[PDB]
């Protein structure tokens, strides 16, 4: 479930911060897609209550963190 590792760089709170807000600014439909990333990326996830998700960057991996940034940035755009 890697095939790289080295390619996956760490995510600083700085970037994550602007991401937390951005992801929240996204529309409902956009949220469903994002939440799915962590829901499938996180092993502990997939609880009996799929209508809830606990995203904790404190324990979350860098792969998932950036994963959302790539989806939020691709939609929100910036340039």
């Amino acid at each position: 479930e890697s095939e790289e590792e080295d390619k996956c760089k760490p995510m600083s709170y700085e970037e994550k911060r602007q991401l937390s807000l951005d992801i929240n600014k996204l529309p409902g439909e956009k949220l469903g897609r994002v939440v799915h990333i962590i829901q499938s990326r996180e092993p502990s996830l997939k609880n009996s209550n799929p209508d809830e998700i606990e995203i904790d960057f404190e324990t979350l991996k860098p792969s998932t963190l950036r994963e959302l940034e790539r989806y939020v940035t691709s939609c929100l755009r910036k340039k």
Partner: peptide, 17 residues
């Protein structure tokens, strides 16, 4: 629609339907 609410954590985003 879906909702979201951060916590005391440094960056814990709680997403829920």
């Amino acid at each position: 629609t879906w909702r979201v609410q951060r916590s005391q954590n440094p960056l814990k985003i709680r997403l829920t339907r």
